[model samples]
Every structure is written in structure tokens, then in C-alpha cells.
Target chain A: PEEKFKIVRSVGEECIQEDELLNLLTKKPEPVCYDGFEPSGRMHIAQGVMKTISVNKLTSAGCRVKIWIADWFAKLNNKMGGDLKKIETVGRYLIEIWKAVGMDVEGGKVEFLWSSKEINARADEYWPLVLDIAQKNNLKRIIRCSQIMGRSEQDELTAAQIFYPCMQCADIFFLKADICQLGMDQRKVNVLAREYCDDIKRKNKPIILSHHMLPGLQQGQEKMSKSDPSSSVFMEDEEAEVNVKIKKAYCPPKVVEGNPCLEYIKYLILPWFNEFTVERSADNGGNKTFKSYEELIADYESGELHPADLKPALSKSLNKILEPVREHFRKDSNAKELLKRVKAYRVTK
Target chain B: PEEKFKIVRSVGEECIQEDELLNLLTKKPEPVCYDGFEPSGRMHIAQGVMKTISVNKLTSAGCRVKIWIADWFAKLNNKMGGDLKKIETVGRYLIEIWKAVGMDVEGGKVEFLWSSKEINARADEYWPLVLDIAQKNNLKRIIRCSQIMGRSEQDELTAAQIFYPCMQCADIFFLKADICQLGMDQRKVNVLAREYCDDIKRKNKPIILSHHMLPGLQQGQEKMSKSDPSSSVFMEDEEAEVNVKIKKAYCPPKVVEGNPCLEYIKYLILPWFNEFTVERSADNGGNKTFKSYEELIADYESGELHPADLKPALSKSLNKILEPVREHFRKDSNAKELLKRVKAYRVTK
Candidate 1:
């Protein structure tokens, strides 16, 4: 059979049990998927990884996907410095990026849900639901969710921030998506969606797919962050910049340990490649041999392959995979138009 | 000088010094005179004593006068028992009483002021003045004023009430009234008004006419009160009821020291009478007495006359003086119409 489905998963955090997700995924070929984007700032690389990669995989798997722009969340979170116009511009940019990434735009499957529009249109309907959810939660519980969502530094939560989690949970149940796709770090919120769904006695229990964490190029221990520009590579980065950053990434010798570049290779590259291999020279302390990328991954797992030799091979593979994306982005008429639009999207305070 | 103005001096606690007031009366004939009435309930005899008596004296003195129906103050005091409609109705009744009492109201020189209308129309102008006065006064100062005003038990020193004193003070200064007329109990508020005028750097410092408290008919020590209905005769009461209450009043021999009936004769009836005298029966007292009201007043001042004999004479004189007023009220179609209108007046909850 021709490859009927492609699986692109996030490695952010464990959001849902694998068995539970697999059971739902195997049930039927349903053209329904869900994703949400926060309009906080310039759409970061981590968001692109979560939204674009996961959404594209679902669309490629013959499942229709619905994407939420979450502008209301941006407004409620008071992020992007509380500028609604900036949120709108950023939201439009996000929609264009998804389209540019070759999402199924015509199947009435890929949707751009702007929470601002949703809220304004259905304020009477959703506000009471939010109030009900808030009534069920105490200040402490809401504050904990805020901290988990990375919206607050202090444990204490304001009423506004406390009600925000309910809104997020409502988004999933409101859309009635078969599979709610989110970064693994959003496990708590996804779980809350299920809890609220059960509380309201929703007939269908929502199934969640929480993807794994994508590590920062600079810091192997931390996830890619938007605040630190050096720790992440943008999708809009030039080929030269991407190559330079990938080349300088942290990869050590001998020990097949917690290496970001090696793990990127093992998780992303090896899994996608049909005839992939790592070719190493003896001087670099590798096996000085050729093997399929899967074999190289197994060897690394078995402590036979050195990590230092694996770095250059991983960089090369990443470059090969990212080259077309960069070239496509470079020539992409829509992205250029989007970039022009974004530059002109200045709002007077 | 031909007594350039017919000075009908009303008996009350004198606010302005007699000498200074005489000087102003002679010099500034066009000086603004102010008196305010709080409609705590139906206009009782005490209201006439505190406000109408003084206002008529001021009008007779050739001073341009303004009578303010303090409807807002009545509401703030909870005098109308949380009923705004009753307050408004009482306000109209108060103005009509002033008109009926022969105030020269047509040329706009003598006029009725409604606090509600003034506040609503000039809130923007007066609100700042209110704030300024309130800023100078702490809660303690306001509470002291409230205690003196007999409103302390009713949450009198609330922020709104505290600011109210300033607004009242501002009213005097705003109108540039030469004299502010109030009951002796409102001495604190009168003092604040004078102080506020000085603070605002106004040259025409208003003299406060703090009138004496009206005595209860049956209670020798207590002032006339609404709660003690038997102690007060309302202007709205029938003539028979008024006479009955007056006849049943407490006035005893040797206890004349604080006899309310004797006090009314000495203070109100004697002061208002011109070349008046009390004809004493020689058979009863064993002394044939012939003296002008002023001479009788002097004897009472010197503690020579007993109050028991004085009570019947005072009641007789009061009945004679009030008989015309009662007949005028009974015959006047407008007064009857006003009573009917006021019947419908009630405060909103």
C-alpha cells in the first residue's frame, strides 16, 4: 500500500498516554484534527514545530485539520504587550505560514479559527461556560494552571488569568475535534478539557495527542525558547545562517549521551529516511563505518557509535531536509507577501 | 433714619454678632441671605421655628433671601426613610410654604433653591469643590459634624455624607450669601461653611445664623422630635389637634426653670409681640399684673415670675397669633392642593 499516513509528533512533554492515542487513531479514518496558536509575539520556531509539523502530518494522513489562531488567548494572556492589532497581524502571519507549509487549504478541512471572532460572535454562549468552569475552580487551581502555561512567574493568579484556562479547555470541546493536537507541555490543559467535557457530560470523550519536546540548538537541556534568539533557528532564517548555527551546535565525543543534535537526528531524520545512513571517519573516533541511519541510531543506543562523528552527519542530514524548505521559503510568493504585510503592520499606540 | 427697613427680628440662636449684623444690615441692603430646610418628615412646628421664622425676619430686614429645599441632604440623612420620591415631594411642599409665608419670590431676589437640581446641573463644577473640602477633612472631623447634626447613628460619616458638608459649604460661597441660616444644632456645619468661604479666598464672609432648637410641648428637657409625635405639632395637623396638644403641654410652678411652654413664651411669643402684655387675674395669683411682653420677658430673665401662670397666657397668645395662619392654611386653595400633592409623595426604596 502506498504510504497512507505520515506521523509527525512533537517531543515537548508527555501530554497523553501513547496507548490511549493509538487506540483512537486506529478506530477510523476521520478527517478531524485540532491545533491552537497563541498570538503572543513573532511566531517562534517552537510554535512552527508544534503547529505546522503536526498539522501537516495530520493533513498528509488524510485527516482534515482545524487550526485556532487564539487571538483572544493573546488578548487575555496580556501578551504581545496587550496590543490587539499586533495580535491580529501576527495571527494573519500565522495563517499564511500554515498555508505556505502546504497544508490542505481547499478540503474545508484546514481551518483558521480566530478566537477574537469566535468570542465576539458567541460571547453569550461561551462566557457562561467560562463562568461555570471558573465556579468549579479555586484561585489556587487556576494559578497552578497559569504557571503550567508559562503565563505567570508567581504562584498567585489574578481572576483574569485564572479564567483563561477554562477558555482554552472550551476551545477543544467547542470545536468537537476528534483528535486535539498540542505540544506535550499542554498536557494539563488537555486533561482539563477532558475533565470539563466529562463534567458537562459530553457524549464523546476528547482524545489528545501531546507531542514531545524539540530541544534548543544551543542548550541540550532546555526546550527551544522564543525569548532567547540564539537558542532557536527561525523558519525564515537564511540557508547560510541555518548551516552556521547547526554546525556550531553542542555535540560531544564517545558518550552517546544527552546530545541535542544526535537526538534530532535519531528522532526526526532516521524516522523519516528510507535509505538513511551515517558515514564516519576513524580519526573522529567513530566506528569509521557506514550503516543505515536506523543502524547508526541503534549503534549509538548500544554504545558502539561516538556522538562527535554523529554531529556532522546529523547536520548534513538536517541541511538536506531543510534546504528545500529554505529555498521554498525564499521563492515562496505567499511568505514574501506575508513578510511585507507584517513589516507594514505597525499600530499606533 | 425712618427705620429705613422694618426689622422683624426672629428669636433663635444668633449666628452673626448683633453689632456686625446691624452694620451689614445698614450698609449692604442687597446682601444675599440663605436658609435651608431638611424635610425629615411632614413640616412640623420646629421647622417653622428654625427656618421660616428666621427667613421671614431676614426678608423683613430688606435682605435678598434664598431658601434652599435641602432634598438631597434629607435623602443622605435617611430622613425620608430611603424614599427619594417623598423627599422630592417634601421639597416642593417646603418651597410652597416659603411662598405662602409671604416671601417676595417673584422678582427672583427671594427664591427657592433645589439642591437636587443644582447638584445634577452643576455636578462637574461642584464635585471638585466637594473633593477639596473633603480632602481637608478627615473621617474624624466629619464624624464630629455628623454627631452634632444628629445623623451620626445613620452612617452619617460615610464618604458621600462627608463630602456633602463641603457641597453645602460650597453652596453658600457659590451664591455669595452674606448670611447662612441654620438651626443651633448645625453650628458645626455653619462653622465649616464660614471656614470654606475663607479658604476659597472669598471676601464676603458669610455670617452663620445658628438658630436655637425648638422645645418639645410636653418634654421640658428634650428638643422637639419627629419620633415623639405628641411633643411636636405638625403644620399639616388640624387646628383642633394643635389646640388640644398645646393645652395638654407640661408647665408647672417653681419647675418653670426649664418649662418648654414658658421658654416658648419668653423666647418666641414675647419677642414677636409688639407692645404686648400678659393680663394676670388678681384673684388667682393675689397680684394684679400689668406689663408689656418685653417687661414680662425681663421679669422672666430676672427669675421673678412663675412658669405655671405663664403657660396659660403663652398658650392663649400663641393660639391668637396662629389662628390667622391656621385659617389661611384652611382657606388657601393652593395649600389644600399642595397637601393633596404631598399625599402622593413617597421615597423610593
Candidate 2:
């Protein structure tokens, strides 16, 4: 059980109450891990590669991953021009990306569910849960959940936006998820679900395993942005495109903090490849492979490793990781069409 | 068309943009009139007799009445212990009252629809409209809609309460209602729907026909309260109960203003019988029959009629109006069971 917990914890940036997670794993060996995505825009590398990697880790640790494709929620957020059809198309595109990116879908461990479909199917069950969650919460408490969508209470929130947090909180109970495996950005609503358990005297509360959000390719960018194409290495970005993005990415020498390059390697590349290799000429430094991020960071901060050396290496690893996805989209007719349609559609906030 | 307009107008205390209503009548002879009821507690005389009379008039004016039995909405409002089954039973009880009270159901002019069933059936079409309405409005605008629920923004509002206004606004469009026939308390959300029409560039906005909300049985009571059974003359109240409630009711002599007794007579009794007859001793005003409310009001205000004379007359008219409903409930097995179960259940805010 401890072994399982460690593997699962490796995928998370923070775990809310580590003991609860450990207990969940011991009690329910194959506990449900919920991860929801609002199919709003193109799949960034973090959403695609990082999520796939995390889900795979979850499944390996004997956890069943329930991926909620939030198509209706996306429409509520006014994404894809609030066109449900476009939102659904985007949802499909997202699933295709996850499938191609090697998510653990083969063993029935990862169940991809659509919010609109599931909610409509069990509307009688779903709506009351949402209302109950909403009832236990006040407007002020619910408004704080705007942070889940990268919004603040000061934002000009629509009624739908205010309504959304309750739905998101309800999703945990609706899916019967034991663990909420989402990004740190979604921490508020996940916490709300746990608080709701307390309020209702629910014995079994969902554990929160908030995964790390990959920063943008640029400096001072809190998270990889969907609108700025250059800021994120999308799931199916070309090799040259990835290289150019990484090359233009901000990476100061010997600086570990706020350095998106090192953060990506630590969160993405190293996690995927299990090692970071920098091939340089003998005059500067011989070919070296750092198995641990700690070792790589120490060398970089001491000015032993350089940005020029790290950028190309990170880009190469990212491109290699993304290669199969691009190939899958190019070869598969359904995925190709979905990608084309998605690319043609205008993204909205 | 003007005749149709006038007939419909007779049911309403205030019609927003009377010209729009006339235009609607001219364009569509059988326009939809949306009326939603959250089955919270016992059906009062106002909700029963007044609404029946108004709906009958609407049907007579060539409008198809869609009576929305808001079972799911009731759960959101935390009504009937938030027990949907209890709420539904109450909804059925409400229908029985309307049927027994002669709401012109035989002509296929009136349709009883469940909000949960209808929304689930057409969820794809319904939720988006809800979201769109929510999106067009801000929190401030939506919070103000607390007035519809007889709540103030200053009240400790649940997130569900905030979400409710948008759902209420969306119901008008969801039901394809051309005319909103509801109480003045619901005027805010009704206007919001019309404002939503303007925002969405919808040319045919729904017309608002806000009916007067009858006050409680006692003095200075703005509306009939469900929590206090004494404040309202329930549909199934015994003839003796009606007499006692009316006798204890606030009816100051030579004063009709702010008098719930007079308002009920004007809205319920007068509309039903077309006359109010007060029978007294020969020394008093003996066997006086006022054909118009104006005549009745003039007599009451000038001290020609006393509270002693008015109370019994009003009670007699009310009992006469309620006799069929009481008999129907007593005779029908289902109605009897529903009433029994509903009365046994505790009412909550």
C-alpha cells in the first residue's frame, strides 16, 4: 500500500492530507482517481503528455482513472463560442490525444466519460447532488472556486460561472471518485468536495492529489497558455516547431527557480525518459546523462550545465515524446479530421 | 386581437409593454403562457383559486397554458425537506386542485409538465439556453433575482439560490412561452428573460403579465405564507376552518386598503362569482349584492359596510369556491393520499 502511494504521489505536485490517500489505497486497492478537463481549446503538452503520464502512473499504482471530458462546462465557460458541437468536437480531439499519448486505456483502468452525456443519463441523480453541494455552500464560498478556472472573485463572473463550481464539486460524488487527481489550479473545488463531506457527515471523503501544472515555454508565465501558441508545445506540434519554441523559451544560466526549461525537464522529460542527456563537444563538456533532476539542477546552478546545452536537449526529448502523437494523427483518418476541424475552429474564452 | 389582449389583460395586474402583448396576440392566436409552481407546501386559495381563474381566462383568450410543476426547482429551493418525491406528490396535489377548481383542462388548452422530466428529455436544448442566459447576466443582476423567491440579496443566499434565477429566466424561453403569466413577485426574472431576448437579438421577446400576489390573512401581511397555516386559506381547508380563519383575519371597518380580505375578494371571489352579496338584518344593509368591485369598495370605504358584514360574506363566497376542491380531494383516493402525505411532511425554508 505504501509502495502504491509513493508511485501515485510521484505524479502529484501536492497531496491534501497524505494519510487519507494512504488509507484510501489500503482500503480500496483499485480506488477511483477523478481528473476532469473542460474541452475548451487545443491540447497543450502539459494537458496531453503530462496528464497521460500521470494517469499511467495512477493505473500502475492500482488506481482506476475517470477522465471527465467537460463539454457542457466548456460551453458554460463560453469556450468554442459556447457552441456545444464545437466543444464536443474539441472533447473528441482531446480523447484522441490521450489515446495516442499512451494513456492506460487498455486494461479498463481509465474510463473517459463525457459530462453532458453522463449528466443527462443520470440527470435525476446528478442535478440533486449539484444542488445539494450548492445548498451547503454560500455565494461567497462558491465564488472562491473561480480559482479552479484560473479566475478570481473580482472577475466579472457570469451566473453560469458561479454555478459551475457547484457542478465541479458535485462531479466527485457523482463519479464516486475516491481520489481527485487534478491540477493544483483545480484545488479549490476539490477541497470544497472534501469540506462538503464534512458538512454532510459523509464518512468517505475524496482525497486530493493535485498534480503539477507545467509552466509556459516563456519566463514569468505562471502556466502554459492555450491562446499563445508559442508559449506551449501542443500535443501535435511539429519537430521544428517544438525546437523553435524551446530555443525562444526563457532559460537563465544557473537559475533553477522560475526557469520553465528546467521545470519542464523535471516534470515532463525526465519523468518520461527517466534521464536527461546533454550531448556537447569535448571542449565544453562531454556527453553526460543525468538520471535525477536534483543532480541536473545542482550542475546547472553551479554553471556546469548551460541553457544552450539544456534547451536543445529538452526540445529533443519533448519532440521525441510527441512524435507518436503526430504520427497517430497523420495516419489515423478520424483523428486527422478531428485535428483539422479543431484547428479550423476559433477558440474563445 | 384586441379582444384577446383585453381578456388576457383582465387576468394580470400589470403587463410589461402592453403593446408587445397585443402584437403577440395578433401574430399568434395560440401563444404559450408559461406558469411555474414550486410545490413547497399546501396550496393556498390565491395559488389555487386565483391561478385557476387566471389560467382559465388565458385559455379562453386563445393561449395554451403550460403549467410547469417545478419539482427539481423545488429541490433547489430546499422546499418540502428537499425531498423530490414529496415535492412531486405535492405537484400532483396541485394538479388535482386545478382540475377540481375547473381550470379548463378539458379543451386541451392547459398542459401539466414536470420540469425535471422536460429538462431531462430536452437537456441538450435546455441547459445551453440556461447557460446562455446566465452568461449574458452578471452576479449583481442575478442576485437581485432573489426577489422572485421572496428573498433579498442581503439574505444568506446559497449558490443554488443564485443559480435559480438563471434557470427561472431560461424556463420562459425553454417552454417557448410568448407570454409569462406569474405573480408580481416573479416580475424580476420575467423581465430578465425579456432583457435576455434583447441581449440575444431575439425579436419576439416574451410578454410579461404579472398577476397580483394576494396578501396573508392578517394585518400588514404582504403575502400569504406557507409556514404559518393560519396565514392562508388552504385549498383543502374545511368550511368551518375557512370561517374561523376569515373571522380572525384583519379586516378593519370602513377600510379596504391593505386589506387581504378585500384583495382576496377582489382577486378571487369577485373574479369567480362576478358579484359579492352581503346578507344582514333588516336594520343593517340587508341582502346587498354589489355587481362590481368598485361598488363594493365604495360601500366598504364609506362605512356602509362593516367588518362584521364583510367577513361572513367573504367566508361564504370562499367556502362556496372551495367546496368542489374539498369534495374532490375527499373522493379521489390518490388526492387523499397525496394530501395526507404532504400534510405529514414538515415544511422548511
Candidate 3:
């Protein structure tokens, strides 16, 4: 019973047929789970912390996790001015951040693989998959899912931009993934994969696990983008930069609903620490430790803790999580070189 | 001047700026010329004969001609139901026919390559070119050029169909072709390639060779397609099939204007035979050899050459041109097996 509930412990773990996932876990010796990233900008808490939690959870559930560093996707999307070198260096930086946050790369149960490397080695197997998926679906299906690209049904999309989703669908099948533990925004493509595979009459379908999407720090907004520098705290943010972003983040007074601060605590801080500890001027509710996210949210909702108190604690929690990653890049020679190279190249549209 | 005009020696040739073609030939040593085909159907007369003449002319003009068998395009278009193995086999069959037709294959000046094989080997080089061309152009532009697929502006097309124009634009750059010897139906995409390379500020523009599109044997129709078995003659047509199709073909009585027979003669037979030889009894107009396509058309238009006289000559002319090719496939062991294998499979849409 305890193991059965572990898969749904997170906020947004909707099963693409819950029974399919349960059956795979029960029968397969070690089912494979996949998550991919377009290594474009600095890793944010959702991509870094939340993703680490998700992958670790999958690994703990007797699954092998594969992290696809989508360097080619970044390049194709014109990130880093389509510079493969820059995209590659940034990919290295992303893997380092994932490792520093503990996504089990060195643990032998997990892999942080590059799309450029995987596709280069197996393009013979890969590109045909892209073509197959593209051929099966019409422009209507792809454009309907263009929300993932910030694109539209009527707006003109580049042919390269259009293949992104098709390539993504092909990636899951080519990766031989049993569980597609993709971010919420990527659900469209994950669904597209099953839709395409089914249309192609492939009996197997990857179980889709839609992870919880963290709300942006900006109030009432949904998307937390890597391109928008101010939207969220990056994994490599300077300590002061983390403080500045958190300080301005929308945390409505005595209201836990839609408060990014509380959302972070529920998704990242508590999941990261098992308990979130807060320091107070012995007057504004003395030093406290939230044994559970429920306890923390309850306290905030009851006005026992204020935004003044929550902001400092959330910043500290995020800073603590990211500090090791920042230092790893600063100290590790390879990562340091990659960071230097990445910083020198400007990101492209 | 004949040597200068050898490359353009066809009713189909339209200069993409004749000056540019002359300049490229003069300045660039043996500049590359290209023609491409999606191996989707049995080789028809237009793709077979006209393409042969077109490519041979390019080679005769001292340009190296590269023929692209777009097996990938065929696969994406769901030819053989998206089965690549079938597509690749068809690609080989296409090359065999081109070789059987004596289209400069043994002459060592022509290069026939498969798109799937090339893209598989150098996808790192190819897909980015696809993406770059895609990024630089609009969806509207690709859809606008969808007419190449015999598609209308308002039809709902698949994403694979949309990438057809982009892949075509990339094919020229990747092949490093200076001249595009695309058939007339592909006028839109060849023009698209030049426009795209121009928009990208690439230093060279491929001089487009718009080959004459043979009119359908059905009167008032613009296209002669392999899909419609009756509208056009297939090179693989048996001796009797050839005669039956031609006898029933829409060759109007004493009118040469828009006659498919005359068009075929102008483009294929005259080019192949160097003269149109018609056999007539002394009562009508004794056996005569018309040395020019213009004169043949003139005699037919003036009601001097009867359809009765014209049909048999046209049939003999075409069958004579195609007889060796049919024999080549039947007699050569390698082509024999390939033909058997290809005939075993059904063409897919």
C-alpha cells in the first residue's frame, strides 16, 4: 500500500492509464523512465529541483532514469545563436547542475545523455521515427500542441520549429522508454507519441506521467520560462540574485492559494528537505520547522506566518539547494570551463 | 553556340537568369547540377525519358549531374505505407531504370544517390540545413509551395508534406549543386530554393532549370501522373501495353496544339531519336523523316499528318525509346530481381 501511493506523492502525477504504469512496475524488472531538457538557459528550480525529485522518485520506484540533454533542440530553436559549441557547453552545465542537485547520474541507475550524441549515433533509427510521426499526423494536431512552443494555430511556424514536436514524439519511442515522466508542458508531445504510435498500430504505448508545473514568481502567470531572466530563480543564480527574486516573488498576505512561495515549499523545499525550517526575530513567531508542507501551508493560511517571514525562509531554502551547484561550477575545472564558454556566448531566439 | 546551348537544348528549359548560368559555368570549374525524385511510383516516361535527356545535357555541357532519389521523402509521404525498407528498395529500382535508360550513369559524369542514405550518414549536416531553411521561411511560404505535391492552398496537409519544400531547398545546398534541373511540376519548390538561399544571404543562387511538364494524355489536363495509370505511359509498360495506351491516348485529329502526343514527341521522342520518322504509303505522303519537332507539329496542324498516321509513329517512337529499358530490367539479373521485388509491393499514398 505504501509503495502503491509513492507514485502519486507529487502534486500533479496524473497517470496515462494508471493501470499501465502499475502493470509495468509490477512485471518489468527495471522499467525505463525518460525526461528531456532543451539545455537553453540557466536551470530553474522546476527543472533542477522539481525534476531531481521526480527522477529520484522514479529511480526509487525501481526504474532507471534517462535525462536527455537536448542540445540539438536548443540549437534548432536558435538558442545560443544555433551555436553547437555553445549549446554543447550549456548542456554540460545543465548536467552538472542536475548532478549537484542529486539526480543520481553517478549512481549507475541514471543517465544524463545528450540528444546530439544519441541521435548522432543512432540517426539511422531516429530520423525515420521523426518522419513516421510527421507523416501520420496532420498540421492541425501539431499546431494544436504549439502551446508548448509559445506558438499558435494561425501564426507562421518555421518548418524546423514544426518538427520539434514530431522529433520529441520519436525520441520517447527511440529511447525505448516505458514511462514518460515529462514536464506538464510536454504532455502534448507525450500524448502525441501515443497517438502516433497507436495510429501506426504499434501495440506498446509509453505510460505518461505529467509532473506538476510550478507557477512563476510573477503573480497569476503560468509559464516560468528560461528565456525570461526575471521570471524565476536560476540554479546558478548568485546568492543575492536569489534573494532579490524571492523578495519580489508574489506571496499574498495570509493566503496560501497560488502563492509561489508556498508552491515552492510544497514542491521543492519540503520535497528537498523533508521539512522546511524558518528563522524568525523571536517575535514574529519564534524559530519553526514545518514537519510537512501541509503544516507549513496551514500555518501561513492561519496568519501565524506572514510573507515577510515566508520570503526569507523560501529564499534560504532555494539558496541552500542551489549553493552546492553554484560552487560545483565554480570549483570543478570541466564545469567551470563550460560555464565560462556558455557565459561568453549570447543566447539566441 | 550549339555547345553553349546544349545544356538548354529542350522545350522545357527556362533560365533562372541565363546570365547566372553562364557566369557559374565560366567561373566555377564544372559546377554541379542537380535533379531529385521521390521514389514513390513506377518510373513513368516523363521522369524517365525527359529527366534522362535533361541530365545528359547537363553532363554533356561539362557539368556534373547529381540525381537524388528522395527515399526519405517517399517514406514520409507514406509511400509503401511509410515502410523505409520498401522505400529504399524502390529507390534502388529508380536508379536501375535511370541506368537502364542510359541516363549518363555509365558515362561516369552523373551521381545517383539516395536521400535516406545520405541523410542517415550525415544527418548532423542535413537536418540543421533543413532547420535553417525552415527557420528562415514562413509556414505560409511552404504551404504556398504545396502545389508541388499536387496540393491546393486550402487543403489540410501533414507536417511531412510541409517539410518537402524545406528538404528540397536544403538538398541543393547539401549537394552543392550550381544548377537545379527540376522538372516543370517542381517549378514552385525550385524557385523556393533560390528564394530561400537568397533570403539567407548565401553567396550563390542555384540557376533553376525548369523542365517542360508533359501534359496529361487526357485533353485539358495539366499533369501526367504515374498514380493515374491511364493518363501517362510508364516506362515499364510491356510492348503491347505501350501500344494500347498510345493508340487510346488523346491525340486529336489534325490539331497539334496542346496535344500530349506532340508534347511527348517534342520533349522525349525528338530528343531521343534526333528526328521524327513517320511511315506512310506513297498514296498519302510516302515515308518521310521530319528532322525537327516544329515541322512535325506544323504538318499535323495543317491537316497533312493524320492521327491515323501520327499514332503509330508516336507509339513506335516511344516504344523504341523505352524498349531497351524494359529489356534491361528484364534481362539484367540484378535489375531483374529488383523489378520482381518492386512489382511484389504495392505503391502507397
The candidate that wins on lDDT is 2
Tens digits of lDDT, candidate 3, A5-92: 3653342467787777667777786888888888786677898889888877767766788888888777666677777877777887
DockQ-based class of model 1: incorrect
Candidate 2: segments with Cα more than 4 A from true spot: none
- Candidate 1 recovers a fraction of native contacts equal to 0.00
Name the docking class for model 3. medium
Per-residue alpha-carbon lDDT of model 2 for A1-349, expressed as tens digits? 9999999988898998999888888988689988889998789999998898899999999889999999888877888877888898899999999999888799789999999889988887887788788888988888899987768889998878887898899989999989888999899899999999999999988889888778898889989888899999889899999999999999999888999999898988888989989988899778889999899889999999998988888888988899999999999999999999999988786
Share of real contacts kept by model 2?
A: 0.79
Q: Residue-wise lDDT of candidate 2 within B124-202, one digit each (tens)?
A: 7887888789888998899898987778989988777877898889898889888999999899999899889888998
Q: How many steric overlaps are in each model, in order?
A: 15, 0, 2
Order of candidate numbers by DockQ, starting with the best = 2, 3, 1
Ranking by TM-score: 2, 3, 1
Local lDDT at A192 for model 3: 92
Task: Write one digit per residue (lDDT tens) for candidate 1, span A240-301.
Answer: 66667767777655444566766566556654453445566556453344335456656667
**Can you tell me which runs of candidate 1 are displaced by over 4 Å?**
A1-349, B1-12, B16-27, B101-109, B153-158, B201-203, B220-222, B275-282, B285-294, B297-309, B340-349
Candidate 3 displacement at residue A183 in angstroms: 1.9
Candidate 1, residues B1-349, lDDT tens digits: the string is: 1252335235345746555565666788576777777766556665653355556566656667777777766755555563567777667676665555444566456777787676656654554455456444443454456544366535414333443465576677656677766677677877876666566676556666666776788755468776666777766666567667777788655454556766666555655564344556675554424345456646666556665556556656666655644565678887666667665554221
- In model 2, how large is the Cα lDDT of residue B231? 85
- The TM-scores of all predictions, comma-separated, are 0.48, 0.97, 0.94
